[PDB]
RNA sequence: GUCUACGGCCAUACCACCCUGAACGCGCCCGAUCUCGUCUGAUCUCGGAAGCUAAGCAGGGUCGGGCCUGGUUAGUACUUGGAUGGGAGACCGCCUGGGAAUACCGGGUGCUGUAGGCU
RNA sequence: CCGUGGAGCAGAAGGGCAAAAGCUCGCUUGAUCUUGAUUUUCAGUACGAAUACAGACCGUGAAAGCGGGGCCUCACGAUC
RNA sequence: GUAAGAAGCCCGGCUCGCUGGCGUGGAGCCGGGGUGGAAUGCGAGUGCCUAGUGGGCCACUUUUGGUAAGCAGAACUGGCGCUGCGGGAUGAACCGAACGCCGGGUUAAGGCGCCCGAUGCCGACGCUCAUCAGACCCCAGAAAAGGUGUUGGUUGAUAUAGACAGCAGGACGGUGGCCAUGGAAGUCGGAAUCCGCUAAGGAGUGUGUAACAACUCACCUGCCGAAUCAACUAGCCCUGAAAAUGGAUGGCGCUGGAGCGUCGGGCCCAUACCCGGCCGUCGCCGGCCUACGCCGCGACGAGUAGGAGGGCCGCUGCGGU
């Protein structure tokens, strides 16, 4: 017949967190994505099940750049996860944004520009089908854990940052990193 | 080949596909004994491949028809030509049978070959089947019946019903 | 204590369990191993393109838009 | 234990064919090889400078680099587990064009010509290929000649 | 009209063939297991319709020892569509009870009714692939008369082989 | 219908013998002062134009030898898959598909890419 | 005079070579520097060997070109 | 091994320090227009962590060493180990077939005299008699050779111009011929080998004599009177065929078969197939009824080492209740 090794979908359908507010958000967005037949509702429901790693914190300057693109004048920026303040920029536009657990340093920086922010329940009350929205997400591969990954730190094209106890001289440098001692990668 | 049950006569005509080098093939015909038309066509293909450069892919069968006996009510004598294959080597053979139908004579030939020589139907090639007169019958077992006013009893007839009156006070007379 | 030396039995099954699919074919595969002179010429042609492109190509685009 | 080598077991693979020895024909040099064309690899014994490995003999691959006296070919070599796209630098003495790509180009040219020509006439021409369909019902002819009877020949040693 | 002039007439080769799986699951080579999976014949004693082409003929010849294929009849197709008819509007096997089930999934081509489905199956044309793929592999029961020499080819006296006109007599007992 | 110069295929066009070659051309051929090199102007190099198709060369012929192609060998030797097929084995037959070569016989034996001189 | 490789190419064999890779002659060290990528056992790690390039200086022939060792397949070695 | 398209083709224009007679060639970029391109089947791609393993064996086929091995060593595929179930009496690998718990029907392989379910069919054709019958891949026994024991076949030769068998008669002359010698007078030897009357007799097929004699045969004929002789070939059976506790078609037994070969119609049952109920997993989901709950449909459930999830299974103690 047919093998049963890939018949079970490994994706998760229930948030492992026990946060009551997150549970209520899931209970609301599940009904929305089930009824309104909105792919935006579907994807924002799927992004709520994700873990801490799959929900990277989007910075403020990245969202500034994403909103500065043409066609994002009055559209609402939606970030499933935490948006953090950026100290590298000095001036910010109106920036009407809806996110989850906005940092306090960015709270004042956004409220002083004149733009108003709102939460996920307010977003659902305002635009159920998700009209006039831009879904943004932070750098998922920007995590440091993804820099130690690859094929192997021994192949001549590794650039994979092998695990080292302490960084400096005489620490994984002699045999396999230079042509003087042994070989070069 | 199985030759299960009774055999059947099939006239099978066939020719190669029309090729640009030459068209209108000679359209060779054969007379095959087989239980059904499928194995009839298979045996025809086998024989025409063994005879000439013809195969099932490069050739085709035009017509395959059941052939009925021209006189099913007449007792006839048939001379069968065999090209059978034994355990040591293959040999030719001429046999004679007495039956009403050509298919019946071929069935008798197959059964008699399989019984007397342990030759399976895989290695039996029926070469020629022709009705012969009583004067050209060389076999004594068949020639002993070409006598009018033939009379013989049926002595020591079996009971054939041993188990219907399985328990009885009788002893069969058998006469 | 003689033992078995080398066989390749029960290997095609192990391979076909995961798959022997072809490598990922993608556009713009790579530029490694290419002639260094050719690569230098390509870099020069790419970096000197915007010097004359944004004017003559724009004029030709306006011309063909006026044509159709 | 099998004496792995660079040219082990090519006694008949890298040898020149019968009655074809001597210097290389000059036609194989004047052939043009550009980047992206599909070519074939066939090891030649007349020259031994840039001959490929015995595992790439008879392999078909596309060209990714061109130099003075050689070409760079991306060949899909099937290692025990998977397939690797390997870059090989082989001279032009062992490389010839692949007629499969030429036939495909001729077919696509015929197709884009046939459709461009039939668009005006409005006839939906069937330019898509198909397998060999079963032949339709045809009428044979015997012209009065009786079909010849075939009989198996008796066995004779 | 051809036999009047003493000339034979050959019909066209049937463009549709019913294939049934005969052998089991375990103990099969991958070369034939892949073809059995591609023919939608996974479990034993199930049958599907195949459009006969140069590729399909060789695909059936590759797995000949594990299949029994033949040329289905109109009544056999009717029975297989009515009694054992199951279509998949989604990844599930829904029984064919109402014409709306066919008109919703396959009505975009003009096969709204089950009669249209039977016609498209028996008169293979431009929209045969979709109609054949919409039908779930026909799960057939075991035969009544008993299969003779399951491991042997039909020509030798078995059942696993080409049964061009004799496959209907087996379909009558399998369904 | 042909040749020369440069070439692709590299014996259908190579080998041995025998016949023909008008007008160009190829060459044979006549001579070592300069360029050049050997024992030798034989060979390679600067001077030709007294004779020739004797030779090379180009065509034609051999119930020619080779080469290519096609029949025969032959659905024959082999071979993919199958059987609770035979035989004690060696091996063989059958079903489904593909299908070789030597003997023997018959047919051919150069086609063309660019520049040029002739009838 | 015949002579298609029946000799020779340093050495065990295989492949390859004829105005040649064989013998002779004349100049010569490209058997020298440098960074990468690639092939071969491969875990596609290293060593060894080898391929095609590129950047300077030279050899050779008139020149196109060839040469960064031996016509090719072995002739060789991490840490400290 | 490659290709069977939109990552492709046609068109126009720019860049090059690459190459270069040439606006030449080749790469890169931009711009607008035109997807239906062999069949069949399927949802794919990708990242991280990672236990166990690192002694294997068997089978069809191809093969290396060996005389051979249930020996050692290889290639593809399958199986056991990782595996139950129906047949092979018995069983690791054979034949079917793969495994949740059940009811009905059917079947694969195999079988239908009794053990033991089903031939208790008025089953068909033919072979076979053993004082050692025979009875189903692996599998558990056998060869060369032989049979005037039967049953088929082939090549041949004779016979009303009366054969083959049987009874009876003849079986002579040249010539006790040529080489031998103690004896060879057809009969121990070498080479030869004819002739005449006949109806036929062979320089003679064998027995015998030291040799001669004698019997007998090839050959012809008399009586009877119509088929017969010889050599091969292959099916059963038989000889060939001898091992040690009493004993193995599984046993009883079986001979107009319960044996061998070819088959027909029925019948017997597996965890296999079809229909239906129930349990669980997965997928698709349905509803604003513990949402961590409540439903609906479809397809699948075996498994050592190992990896995960659930437990309203269980033991002890602590904070709340
Ligand atoms: Mg499982
Ligand atoms: Mg997994
Ligand atoms: Mg080991
Ligand atoms: Mg029944
Ligand atoms: Mg001088
Ligand atoms: Mg001088
Ligand atoms: Mg001179
Ligand atoms: Mg001359
Ligand atoms: Mg002359
Ligand atoms: Mg000749
Ligand atoms: Mg076989
Ligand atoms: Mg040598
Ligand atoms: Mg040699
Ligand atoms: Mg250089
Ligand atoms: Mg051992
Ligand atoms: Mg072994
Ligand atoms: Mg174990
Ligand atoms: Mg397993
Ligand atoms: Mg098992
Ligand atoms: Mg059992
Ligand atoms: Mg089998
Ligand atoms: Mg099996
Ligand atoms: Mg049951
Ligand atoms: Mg059975
Ligand atoms: Mg009973
Ligand atoms: Mg015996
Ligand atoms: Mg047994
Ligand atoms: Mg034993
Ligand atoms: Mg006998
Ligand atoms: Mg007994
Ligand atoms: Mg199941
Ligand atoms: Mg399980
Ligand atoms: Mg408790």
Write up what this structure looks like.
This is part of a larger assembly, with chains A (about 180 residues), B (about 180 residues), C (about 70 residues), D (about 160 residues) and E (about 180 residues). Chain A is mainly α and about 180 residues long. Chain A starts with 19 loop residues before the first helix and ends in a 49-residue tail after the last strand. Chain A has five helices and three strands; from the N terminus they run αααββααβ. Chain C has about 70 residues and is an all-alpha fold. Chain D is α+β, with helices and mostly antiparallel strands and about 160 residues long. Chain D has one helix at about 100-120, and strands at about 40, 60-65, 70-80, 85-90, 95. Chain D has a five-stranded antiparallel β-sheet with strand order 4-3-2-1-5, with no helix packed on it. The longest helix of chain D is centred in the last third of the chain and has 23 residues, at about 100-120. The two termini of chain D are about 50 Å apart. Chain E has about 180 residues and is of the alpha+beta class. In chain E, strands 3-1-2-6 form a four-stranded antiparallel β-sheet. Chain E has a two-stranded antiparallel sheet with strand order 4-5. In chain E, a hairpin with a 6-residue loop joins β4 and β5 (about 95). Chain E is globular and about 45 Å long. Chain E starts with 15 loop residues before the first strand and ends with a helix. Chains in contact: B-D, B-E, C-D, D-E. The interface of B and D includes residues 48 and 62 of B. One magnesium ion binds near residues 3 and 4 of chain C. Chain D binds three RNA strands through β1, β2, β3, β4 and α1.
Q: How many distinct beta strands of chain B?
A: 6
Chain pair sharing the greatest interface: B-D, 23 and 13 residues
> Residue share in helices of chain E?
25-40%
Order of helical and strand elements of chain B: EEHEEEHEH
What is the ordering of alpha helices and beta strands of chain E? Answer: EHEHEHEEHHHEH
Shape, principal axes of CA atoms of chain E: globular
Q: Which percent bin holds the helix content of chain B?
A: 10-25%
Give the radius of gyration of chain E: 17 Å
Q: Based on Cα principal axes, name the global outline of chain B.
A: elongated
Largest sheet of chain E: 4 strands, antiparallel
Cofactors, ions, other ligands:
magnesium ion
């Amino acid at each position: 017949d047919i093998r049963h090794n890939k018949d079970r979908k490994v994706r998760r359908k229930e948030p492992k967190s026990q946060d009551i507010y997150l549970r209520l958000l899931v209970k609301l967005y599940r009904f929305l994505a089930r009824r309104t037949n909105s792919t935006f509702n579907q994807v924002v429901l799927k992004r709520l099940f994700m873990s801490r790693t799959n929900r990277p914190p989007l910075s403020l300057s990245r969202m500034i750049r994403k909103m500065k693109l043409p066609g994002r004048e009055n559209k609402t920026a939606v970030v499933v996860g935490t948006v953090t303040d950026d100290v590298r920029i000095l001036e910010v536009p109106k920036l009407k944004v809806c996110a989850l657990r906005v940092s306090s340093r960015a709270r004042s920086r956004i409220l002083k520009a004149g733009g108003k922010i709102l939460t996920f329940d307010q977003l659902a009350l305002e635009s159920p089908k998700g009209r006039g929205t831009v879904l943004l997400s932070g750098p998922r591969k920007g995590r440091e854990v993804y820099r130690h990954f690859g094929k192997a730190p021994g192949t001549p094209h590794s650039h994979t940052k092998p695990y080292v106890r302490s960084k400096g001289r005489k620490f994984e440098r002699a045999r396999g990193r230079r042509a003087s001692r042994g070989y070069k990668n | 080949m199985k030759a299960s049950g009774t055999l059947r006569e099939y006239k099978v005509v066939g020719r190669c596909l029309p090729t640009p080098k030459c068209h209108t093939p000679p359209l060779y015909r054969m007379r095959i004994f087989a239980p059904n038309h499928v194995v009839a066509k298979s045996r025809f293909w086998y024989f025409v491949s063994q005879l000439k450069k013809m195969k099932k892919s490069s050739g085709e069968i035009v017509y395959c028809g059941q052939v009925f006996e021209k006189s099913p009510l007449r007792v006839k004598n048939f001379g069968i030509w065999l090209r059978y294959d034994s355990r040591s080597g293959t040999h030719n053979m001429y046999r004679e049978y007495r039956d009403l139908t050509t298919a019946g004579a071929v069935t008798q030939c197959y059964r008699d070959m399989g019984a007397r020589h342990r030759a399976r139907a895989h290695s039996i090639q029926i070469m020629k089947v022709e009705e012969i007169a009583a004067g050209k019958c060389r076999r004594p077992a068949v020639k002993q019946f070409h006598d009018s006013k033939i009379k013989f009893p049926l002595p020591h007839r079996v009971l054939r019903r041993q188990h219907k009156p399985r328990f009885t006070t009788k002893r069969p007379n058998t006469f | 204590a003689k033992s078995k030396n080398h066989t390749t039995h029960n290997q095609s099954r192990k391979w076909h369990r995961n798959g022997i699919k072809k490598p990922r074919s993608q556009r713009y595969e790579s530029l490694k191993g290419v002639d260094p002179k050719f690569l230098r010429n390509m870099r020069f042609a790419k970096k000197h393109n915007k010097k004359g492109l944004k004017k003559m190509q724009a004029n030709n685009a306006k011309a063909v838009s006026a044509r159709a | 234990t099998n004496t792995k080598g660079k040219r082990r077991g090519t006694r008949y693979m890298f040898s020149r064919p019968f009655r074809k020895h001597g210097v290389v024909p000059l036609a194989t040099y004047m052939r043009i090889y550009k980047k992206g064309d599909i070519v074939d690899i066939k090891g030649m014994g007349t020259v031994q400078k840039g001959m490929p490995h015995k595992c790439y003999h008879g392999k078909t691959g596309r060209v990714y680099n061109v130099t003075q006296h050689a070409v760079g070919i991306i060949v899909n070599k099937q290692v025990k587990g998977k397939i690797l796209a390997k870059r090989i630098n082989v001279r032009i003495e062992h490389i010839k064009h692949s007629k499969s790509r030429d036939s495909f180009l001729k077919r696509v040219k015929e197709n884009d010509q046939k459709k461009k020509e039939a668009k005006e006439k409005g006839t939906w021409v069937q330019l898509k290929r198909h397998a060999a369909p079963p032949r339709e019902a045809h009428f044979v002819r015997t012209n009065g000649k009786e079909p010849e009877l075939l009989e198996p020949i008796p066995y004779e040693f | 009209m051809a036999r009047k002039a003493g000339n034979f007439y050959v019909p066209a080769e049937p463009k549709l063939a019913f294939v049934i799986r005969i052998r089991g699951i375990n103990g099969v080579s991958p070369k034939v297991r892949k073809v059995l999976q591609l023919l939608r014949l996974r479990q034993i004693f199930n049958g599907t319709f195949v459009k006969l082409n140069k590729a399909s003929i060789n695909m059936l010849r590759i797995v000949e020892p594990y299949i029994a294929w033949g040329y289905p009849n109109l009544k056999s197709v009717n029975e297989l569509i009515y009694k054992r008819g199951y279509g998949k509007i989604n990844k599930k096997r829904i029984a064919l009870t109402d014409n709306s089930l066919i008109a919703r999934s396959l009505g975009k081509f003009g096969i709204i009714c089950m009669e249209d489905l039977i016609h498209e199956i028996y008169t293979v044309g431009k929209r045969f692939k979709e109609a054949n793929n919409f039908l779930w592999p026909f799960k057939l029961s075991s035969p009544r008369g008993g299969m003779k020499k399951k491991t042997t080819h039909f020509v030798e006296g078995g059942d696993a082989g080409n049964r061009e006109d004799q496959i209907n007599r087996l379909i009558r007992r399998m369904n």
